[PDB]
Structure 1
Amino acid sequence: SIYDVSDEFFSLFLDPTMAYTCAYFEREDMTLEEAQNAKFDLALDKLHLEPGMTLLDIGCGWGGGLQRAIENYDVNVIGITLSRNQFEYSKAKLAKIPTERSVQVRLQGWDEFTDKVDRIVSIGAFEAFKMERYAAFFERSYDILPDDGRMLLHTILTYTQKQMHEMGVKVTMSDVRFMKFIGEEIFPGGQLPAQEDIFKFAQAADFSVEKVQLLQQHYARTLNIWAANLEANKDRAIALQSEEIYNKYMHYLTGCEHFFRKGISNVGQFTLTK
């Protein structure tokens, strides 16, 4: 399976910050790492952080995001992931950053988390959720934030066939073939949300959506690069794993890129306020 590969495997195509999400090429000539930090800065600015606050990163991945938070803001931070790989890797990377604040890494899910915070960020972890938990997720998010609390949710988004038809988006058979590949290798029963779903469940918990920012073509470029890297690191990827996992990932990356490029997929940042 592709879920059993090492962090060292991801390093064959991810940027030095180990960000496995959509990059933000605020400038067309940005590098991947520069675009990645830009994405993080983009998200963090939206939270209106003041010194002394506490920030929560739900599904902190390999820590690239909490790094920017410590460096550029004077706040306590808490990151929670369920990957032990990430948990130990992030705890180590983040310990090397100077700070006069608290820094806690926990191997923990959001259902377990119950501490009070001031701001919340989530990037790429939502698409791993089941639609049956959406309501509870926002209910917990809303409950730990303060009166003026704010949260930024970054997540991939999908369309309905109606909308895709409305946009002249012609889904071919190959596209459907790739969808099964997803439901087989990636999504063991998992419905990806559409923009309106975010609004519904978010506002249902009494949040206020103040902005959504969509970055379709950024992910296509993001994906275009990850793929090229793994291809350049082909022989090493096989050595780490096998030609099977290699071809598996290539197909995954290249297909996901095509979906964002053609217009089947999207990715948005939702600013939610309390």
Structure 2
Amino acid sequence: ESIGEIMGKLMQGEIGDEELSKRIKEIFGKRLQWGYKPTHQQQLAFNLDFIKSLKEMYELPSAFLEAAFGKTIKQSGCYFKDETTTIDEAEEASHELYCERAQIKDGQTVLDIGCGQGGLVLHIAQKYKNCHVTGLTNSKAQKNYILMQAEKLQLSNVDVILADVTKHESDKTYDRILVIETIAHMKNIQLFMKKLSTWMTEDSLLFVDHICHKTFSHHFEAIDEDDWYSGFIFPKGCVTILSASALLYFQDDVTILDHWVVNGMHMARSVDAWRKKLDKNMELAREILLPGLGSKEAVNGVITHIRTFCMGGYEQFSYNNGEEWMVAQMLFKKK
């Protein structure tokens, strides 16, 4: 079977969920074989090579997003206490976790880099009325959504910077900088962390949450010629999965204070909840998308892409009961 063949059946809805899950699980299995080395000597050689290599380097309508994601349209791993925890509850729990670990206190200036649909920005703004909370996003649609929500929620302490963070120049500093699942998209990590440090003072803290593998780093890209999945999900080579410890080697400009990981079952439950909600609201979703996409085929294409992302993410993060791919968190101060 060629890529073309599998892609054909997938797009026609000819692959059942069990086969789809099985196929993607196998692809991730091959990544594990690629990444695990026989000795720690070899593991560190592999990991440091990757780290050294790094140092050399249309939008969906909000109504569709509301029908697939949770209440605040969080697009990052959430935190599920119970088997019965809803996605809305898991969003709030994860916001709370970030506030704790980043040591948010009322009255601080807070910058959220790559703030998405602004769930965390709105959470902090509501909980800490004396905080001034700035979201930074490269999407005008996202900025517009956040500002409307802030207006609706009677929040007066929210602003949004519309910028490519890699290009953004400012003299402004913040007490707290948060980066929630944005760093995977950063082409230039060393320069990224350096830039963030220039937006900190001696009293600031930087909190980063990133998708990871516990042991090794990898680009999200085809493992071989049999891998139809990786390039389907990310048609660009624009996504890097750092190991859980990779950022420890990026302390030129910031210094680590604390380090955690969150088991991958939380991410797995997140993507599962999105997949189930999209499935439930499938008819509605196809209706919402049709105007802006132009044809039922183009609508089916976008839905297949998002649904497959969730199915694949489930297999990735649930692998070995969440003990392969997971979420890493780090707290830093400025040098």
Tell me, yes or no, whether TM beats 0.5.
Answer: yes
Query: Equivalent residue for 2:316?
Result: 259
SS in 2 for 1:48: coil
Query: Equivalent residue for 1:216?
Result: 264
SS in 2 for 1:106: strand
TM value normalised by structure 2: 0.70
Structure 2 regions of 5+ residues with no counterpart? 1-57, 291-298
* CA distance in 2 between partners of 1:175 and 1:24 (Å): 33
- Which of residues 199, 203, 224 in structure 1 aligns to 2:248? 199
- Which of residues 216, 233, 237 in structure 2 aligns to 1:182? 233
Give 1:154 deviation, angstroms.
Answer: 1.3
Name the count of aligned residue pairs: 258
Query: Equivalent residue for 2:111?
Result: 56
After superposition, the Cα gap between the structure-2 partners of 1:162 and 1:48, relative to the gap in structure 1 and judged at 3 Å, is closer
Contact 2:138 2:165 in 1 (8 A): no
Question: What percent of counterpart residues are identical?
Answer: 23
User: Could you tell which deviates more after superposition, 83-92 or 187-196?
Assistant: 187-196
SS in 2 for 1:149: strand
- Residue pairs, 1:140-159, within 5 angstroms: 140-158=195-213
Letter in 1 for 2:142: Q
Would you say 1:80 and 2:128 are equivalent positions? no
Contact 1:63 1:94 in 2 (8 A): no
Give 1:236 deviation, angstroms.
Answer: 2.2
Contact 1:210 1:273 in 2 (8 A): no
- Which of residues 66, 83, 108 in structure 2 aligns to 1:11? 66
Spell out, residue by residue over 1:223-251, the C-alpha distance to the aligned partner (whole angstroms, 9 max, x if none): 11100111112222223241121122111
SS in 1 for 2:330: strand
Give 1:160 deviation, angstroms.
Answer: 6.1
Query: Equivalent residue for 1:168?
Result: none
Query: Equivalent residue for 1:167?
Result: none
After superposition, the Cα gap between the structure-2 partners of 1:175 and 1:138, relative to the gap in structure 1 and judged at 3 Å, is farther
Give 1:181 deviation, angstroms.
Answer: 2.3
Spell out, residue by residue over 1:181-213, the C-alpha distance to the aligned partner (whole angstroms, 9 max, x if none): 2342xx434332222222112x23232141223
* CA distance in 2 between partners of 1:134 and 1:204 (Å): 11
Structure 1 regions of 5+ residues with no counterpart? 164-171
Query: Equivalent residue for 2:97?
Result: 42
Contact 2:213 2:242 in 1 (8 A): yes
Would you say 1:272 and 2:312 are equivalent positions? no
Contact 1:142 1:205 in 2 (8 A): yes
Would you say 1:228 and 2:276 are equivalent positions? yes
- Residue pairs, 1:84-99, within 5 angstroms: 84-99=140-155
Letter in 2 for 1:243: N
User: Could you tell which deviates more after superposition, 236-245 or 251-260?
Assistant: 236-245
TM value normalised by structure 1: 0.85
Q: Work out which of the two has the higher radius of gyration on C-alpha atoms and give 1 or 2.
A: 2
- Which of residues 113, 116, 134 in structure 1 aligns to 2:173? 116
Give 1:258 deviation, angstroms.
Answer: 0.7
Letter in 2 for 1:206: V
Query: Equivalent residue for 2:304?
Result: 247
Letter in 1 for 2:153: I
After superposition, the Cα gap between the structure-2 partners of 1:35 and 1:161, relative to the gap in structure 1 and judged at 3 Å, is closer
* CA distance in 2 between partners of 1:141 and 1:222 (Å): 29
Spell out, residue by residue over 1:120-162, the C-alpha distance to the aligned partner (whole angstroms, 9 max, x if none): 11112212222xx101111121222121211111111136679
Contact 2:216 2:242 in 1 (8 A): no
After superposition, the Cα gap between the structure-2 partners of 1:211 and 1:160, relative to the gap in structure 1 and judged at 3 Å, is closer
Spell out, residue by residue over 1:58-111, the C-alpha distance to the aligned partner (whole angstroms, 9 max, x if none): 111111111110121121111110111111000110123345x64211211323
RMSD: 2.5
* CA distance in 1 between partners of 2:241 and 2:217 (Å): 16
